[PDB]
Design a protein around this ligand. Structure first.
Ligand SMILES: Nc1ncnc2c1ncn2[C@@H]1O[C@H](COP(=O)(O)OP(=O)(O)OP(=O)(O)O)[C@@H](O)[C@H]1O
Ligand SMILES: Nc1ncnc2c1ncn2[C@@H]1O[C@H](COP(=O)(O)OP(=O)(O)OP(=O)(O)O)[C@@H](O)[C@H]1O
Ligand SMILES: Nc1ncnc2c1ncn2[C@@H]1O[C@H](COP(=O)(O)OP(=O)(O)OP(=O)(O)O)[C@@H](O)[C@H]1O
Lengths: 343, 343, 343
């Protein structure tokens, strides 16, 4: 009956994205974004959601769920795959939200980016930034690139994540992934340890604290290729942001350094497609002879004009002329309506 | 005799709003706002108000009432309903103030708002703000809306409250309610956990600390519909307030963000009615094509002029022309007498 | 089989720079900068990388790897040499990165610097600064100089390092090396203890905190010859930097003091050579009668012009006219292209 391992069975069996456990109701499941209660077998759950949750939690997690009202952790079931779990107290009673963790890195062509992007993965050092709002394929793009390196280079890759989304098998290189909160205390002191761990590639899950970006740039300018993720929407947004989070006492020297070490920037958005509904739009900036200097001279508004690698709106039109994204979709995604409509 | 469970019996039997326990007197009761001592059965209470209070308190509550001079907690009696209890030391002796907690969410038509409000509950993401002073129906309006969603959408609703006023049954969706101080340490780290708990709707009981509003806006602009409650009196008050509690280093960018994500604002006041005495007045602002831009350009005084959804005074006149609220009632409730009197 | 001591055997046997231990894969090895998995003997490693790592760790290290997710430590195997080890948690599982520590200080002529440098090692007191980015031979140059003193002077040398790179045998003098994190708590309170330890020569591994540079300069101006290492690229960079990290309340008095006590500055870069690939370029400034005063009068841009000891670009041309470093190599290494190309 009420066995967590069997609840999971039925969830993937129905292609569920999430499962939810709360007292009053039977086990719930999110399918296509709709919550459905799998009455199938299990009946309305007693306060012994606590019993189910526990059958999955470590001892330092159960400790934690007491010290504070919630835990965020991952667990693996050999049968199927891996799962992210947030357990918490609801109405004096125990509640849980399990998520499915991706079991397979997509092929690069599957994504939507051009092959001009893959050229970044061959650069010897510098910063590769993939940005965009939560749910625009940032983690996917990175995983595709890190695994592309993994297939082709004899490197030592190190990733610092929150949480570990996709997982890597050893191939031509040797991959180590560290989860903040489980393997290490912080992005920062993990990235600091990373400098002494002989890595070829370093991947910061997120760069939200300044101290991290400060270590992230240090690494980049010291022989490493570093992958980083922001939440910005354009490329100019990105460069402006990481600069304008430093004290303006040598914020100009950030612009100098970034301009040497910034290797490429990809900003992503997932718009609805006409087939299966899933299409990626993007801004792409791989700096060259000219671009490099404009950033040093902080002439960023004039940078946009040289961009013919490809501006965000150009990606929108290209996706429209072929016939995938609609006009208003192409318009609501657009940073500036004025550049389009002209198309 | 002196049995807490029986005292409660007699209180609802007389339709009491509160019951009060203190040493010198017999158990007291608030009926229609007047304190009456139910001599009925129980006699003048000994210092063993402590005995009664305890028969209702958890162990971490009795601990707390020692560590500090008071506790605030909720407890449920299957017989009738749920009760909020504040226990504290009076004159070296134990005292208690129990409140009745609402056992049934009202129908939306019962309230007083138009059906234009219910359209908010269908919005995919953004901020729904219900404001007003304590005792203007904020919690009621929200409960009516969250339960309306609950009846019609297959969502996962999460509320973070202080305390949990109304309680929800699972219906078409799956509802989780977390009480700050019992299930979680803070609004903020509960709202932070909320982001990882796969919710469709998030409800912040109160947004008094900036850090909360900062997370609340983040959630809103990241795919969630978020319900929030202030203490402001007008809609312009509201927008001005949440903006002017951010450091003015990017306080202008709050105005930009709010204008994209602010879905509707309802400000409420409960004026005396001629029948049973209970009528709601309100200001309603659902932004559209034009309004959106005025807020970005911080032209808020000119926003008022476009409002014909409905200004606070228009609600007052409408309630008067029909014959419910008196002239001075309509005047003392009014933000500006000058707009009315002209009616 | 799986014996750490034997894994090491095979690594030096193949002339490895690093060895890497992680669960999924067999023991890895970096040869010529390429990761190769030595399937030779050991098979795919179980989570009992933990077993191997432990056979090398002290008790306060194994404690540490628990308190925090990683340790950085050194260990010695009589058979071959010494090894730097960073152990850390990867995917809930134990991972390790061992480095080879240099077993023999090079002859000074082997380096690339002129004999004008060795004259510094005979100075009675002052500051000798070797600078450059990680991997430009800073530690080598110092070790060559300290050991040169060791062979010829009856001194008491003290070094404070992070970690102890090269190790010294007692010769004509008596050498003491202290590792920050193992023998002492900090560079600073080690340098502070150094003042009371009767040393002739003091060597600060790194001078990143101001408090250190403040003690480092104190020592210099108090009878000691002090060796220090920065990350700057030019000599003017160096002097400007250490000055501009003091509060400008008496930052001018730093310029006065530095100008008395700065004995020499060497800034290094390792460019690719045509033979074995390994050649050193450098900027050299040994102040004299005139130079001393220019620094007091902060006329540093005019200092460059008097430099005919030798400017960075002059070193580049000299290495090119002989035929070692290529034009673009000489150009990309150059601080200013404009000075060269004229050659
Ligand atoms: N380029 C793409 N085209 C179509 N679908 C994609 C693409 N990238 C990702 N997806 C899908 O969309 C969902 C969200 O992707 P992903 O998690 O990579 O984005 P993200 O939220 O920016 O990353 P993160 O996990 O760091 O927040 C996933 O289920 C993924 O399979
Ligand atoms: N629209 C309304 N019309 C008439 N009576 C109402 C209305 N809304 C609430 N009431 C009644 O008035 C009292 C106060 O309502 P409520 O507690 O919702 O207001 P509030 O104090 O603003 O909310 P909160 O509990 O967050 O302070 C309740 O007893 C409720 O039944
Ligand atoms: N002058 C030189 N010429 C050729 N090779 C050198 C020279 N100096 C050092 N090397 C080699 O280059 C590598 C890096 O040298 P070293 O570690 O001294 O530089 P560094 O990184 O500046 O010092 P540190 O250990 O303080 O970071 C070593 O393997 C060393 O053998």
């Amino acid at each position: 009956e009420l066995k967590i391992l069997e609840i999971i069975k039925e969830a993937i069996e129905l292609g569920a994205s999430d499962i939810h456990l709360t007292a009053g109701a039977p086990p719930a499941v999110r399918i296509d974004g709709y919550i459905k209660f799998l009455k199938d077998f299990p009946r309305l759950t007693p306060e012994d959601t606590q019993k189910l949750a526990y059958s999955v939690m470590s001892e330092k997690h159960r400790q934690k769920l007491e010290e504070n009202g919630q835990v965020d952790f991952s667990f693996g079931v050999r049968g199927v795959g891996r799962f992210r779990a947030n357990v918490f107290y609801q109405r004096g009673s125990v509640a849980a939200a399990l998520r499915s963790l991706p079991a397979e890195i997509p092929e690069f062509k599957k994504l939507g980016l051009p092959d001009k992007v893959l050229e970044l993965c061959h650069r010897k050092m510098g910063l590769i930034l993939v940005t965009g709002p939560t749910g625009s394929g940032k983690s996917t793009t990175i995983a595709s690139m890190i695994d592309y390196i993994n297939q082709t280079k004899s490197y030592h890759i190190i990733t610092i994540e929150d949480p570990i989304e996709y997982v890597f098998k050893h191939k031509k290189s040797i991959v180590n992934q560290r989860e903040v909160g489980e393997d290490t205390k912080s992005f920062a002191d993990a990235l600091r340890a990373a400098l002494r761990e002989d890595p070829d590639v370093i991947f910061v899950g997120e760069m939200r604290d300044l101290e991290t970006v400060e270590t992230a740039l240090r690494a980049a300018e010291t022989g490493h290729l570093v992958f980083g993720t922001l939440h910005t929407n354009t490329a100019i947004d990105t460069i402006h942001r990481i600069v304008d989070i430093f004290p303006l006492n040598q914020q100009e020297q950030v612009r100098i350094v970034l301009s040497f070490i910034l290797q490429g920037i990809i900003s992503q958005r997932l718009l609805p497609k006409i087939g299966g509904g899933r299409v990626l739009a993007y801004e792409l900036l791989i700096p060259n002879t000219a671009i490099r200097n404009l950033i040093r001279e902080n002439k960023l508004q004039q940078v946009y004009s040289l961009m013919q690698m490809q501006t965000m709106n150009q990606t929108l039109y290209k996706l429209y002329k072929q016939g995938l994204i609609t006009l208003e979709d192409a318009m609501e995604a657009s940073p500036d309506p004025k550049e389009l409509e002209r198309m």
